């Protein structure tokens, strides 16, 4: 059984250097033709290939990132390290390392190369956020209005993830939509949480927001304005 | 470099259906192509290697064929765990490219979004910023287009949006879009509009308000 696992800092600041380690078990980087590669996935985006290293020590890099990447192996520790320099916000992504089989051998003779055509086992992935922001609590603002009515709370400018939002201390669940946060160009996150109700219920509505990182709890009652 | 284009980018289906996803390469990649299935929150999982070989431990309903520039993955009888995003990967040329992915989600009848526009709170305005949010609630299919207009000027580069994951009961999606402006710019205009295009809407729907109107 082959397993891989990524480790490194979850948070990194722009211009800094990011070092990611892939520790694995079940194979050796001294085994014939084996490879270990790195692939990343920005939130909501497609997979992007970064680099790979083989047991005979040949290395290859994405041409778009070549100047900022270094991949290396430590055979005796069963680890592969990928160093990315000068990171910027667009480098925020989940980073995965993965195993690549070498050709099948028969009495130590390569006879099948078909198994090298895939990365067959992947690590769970490690989430890395690139932002110069310091820990900071959200500002919470009201969002106020088939014949459904909508209202919500805009949880703005906080760092880092995550934040939790519930409605009426947990009693309101139907019609609730809490969207995934977006990382603003400022380096702070922002999210909305809304709830749809029969245009008659306008019943009281309060969003309970909690950002553990900054010890910031806020309850904000939201109503249909006009005094 | 080499381009790998997946089709369709998104696909709706129901348990028991037969689906086929295709991947086309800009130059021939021989048989060096792999297919993966990735479920939300998890790493991609290898299904098919070398264009058509079934990876060990992978269920037989998955099948891959093709070589050169055109490949296909077919799942013969879709199971609930197959609602996910699929990717193809080429390993003939460096860099070892991935396709754009194809999202497979639960099919349900077309439903237009209920649209709502929210002006910025007076509380936010006092801090100097103005957020205008637009909500597209419970729609299907997933693709929707939101266009912000301020006093009829098309907005660009000053909004961000996020979409919920498919609802497990509804099978619909919801989308939130935030237009952000300084309090000053905000004050220099009157009509804030959120224009929405979607398959379930005969023509675009616009929700708006005039700033300061009381």
């Amino acid at each position: 059984r082959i397993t891989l696992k990524e480790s490194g800092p979850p948070l990194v600041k722009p211009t800094q250097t990011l070092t990611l380690t892939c520790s694995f078990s079940g194979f050796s980087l001294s085994d014939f033709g084996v490879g270990v590669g790195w692939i990343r996935q920005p939130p909501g985006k497609a997979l992007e290939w970064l680099a790979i290293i083989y047991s005979d020590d040949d290395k290859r890099y994405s041409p778009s990132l070549n100047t900022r990447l270094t991949i290396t192996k430590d055979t005796s520790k069963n680890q592969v390290v990928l160093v990315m320099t000068r990171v910027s916000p667009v480098d925020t992504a989940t980073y995965f390392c993965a195993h690549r089989r070498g050709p099948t051998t028969l009495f130590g003779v390569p006879i099948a190369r078909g198994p090298v055509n895939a990365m067959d086992v992947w690590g769970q992935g490690i989430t890395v956020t690139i932002s110069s922001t310091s820990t900071k609590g959200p500002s919470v603002f009201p969002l106020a209005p088939g014949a459904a009515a909508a209202l919500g709370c805009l949880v703005k400018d906080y760092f880092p993830e995550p934040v939790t939002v519930s409605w009426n201390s947990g009693a309101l669940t139907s019609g609730v939509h809490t969207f995934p946060a977006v990382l603003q160009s400022s380096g702070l996150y922002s999210l909305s949480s809304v709830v749809t109700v029969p245009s008659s219920s306008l019943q009281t509505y309060t969003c309970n927001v909690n950002h553990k990182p900054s010890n910031t709890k806020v309850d904000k009652r939201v109503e249909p304005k006009s005094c | 470099a080499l381009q790998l284009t997946q089709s369709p980018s998104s696909l709706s289906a129901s348990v028991g259906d037969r689906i086929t996803i295709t991947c086309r390469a800009s130059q021939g990649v021989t048989s060096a192509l792999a297919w993966y299935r990735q479920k939300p929150g998890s790493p991609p999982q290898l299904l098919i290697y070398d264009a058509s070989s079934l990876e060990s431990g992978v269920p037989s309903r998955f099948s891959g064929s093709g070589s050169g520039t055109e490949f296909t993955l077919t799942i013969s009888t879709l199971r609930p765990e197959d609602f996910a995003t699929y990717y193809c990967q080429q390993l003939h040329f460096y860099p070892h490219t991935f396709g754009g992915g194809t999202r497979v989600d639960v099919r349900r009848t077309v439903a237009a979004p209920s649209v709502f526009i929210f002006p910025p709170s007076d509380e936010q305005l006092k801090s100097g910023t103005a957020s205008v949010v637009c909500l597209l609630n419970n729609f299907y299919p997933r693709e929707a287009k939101v266009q912000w207009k301020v006093d009829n000027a098309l907005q660009s580069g000053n909004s961000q949006e996020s979409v919920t994951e498919q609802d497990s009961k509804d099978s619909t999606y919801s989308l939130s879009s935030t237009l952000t402006l300084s309090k000053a710019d905000y004050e220099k205009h009157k009509v804030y509009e959120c224009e929405v295009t979607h398959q379930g809407l005969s023509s675009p729907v616009t929700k708006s308000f005039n700033r300061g109107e009381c």
């Binding site: 290859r60 | 390993l91 003939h92």
Partner: peptide
């Protein structure tokens, strides 16, 4: 260029 295992 060609992958490690290509012709």
């Amino acid at each position: 260029e060609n992958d490690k295992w290509a012709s």
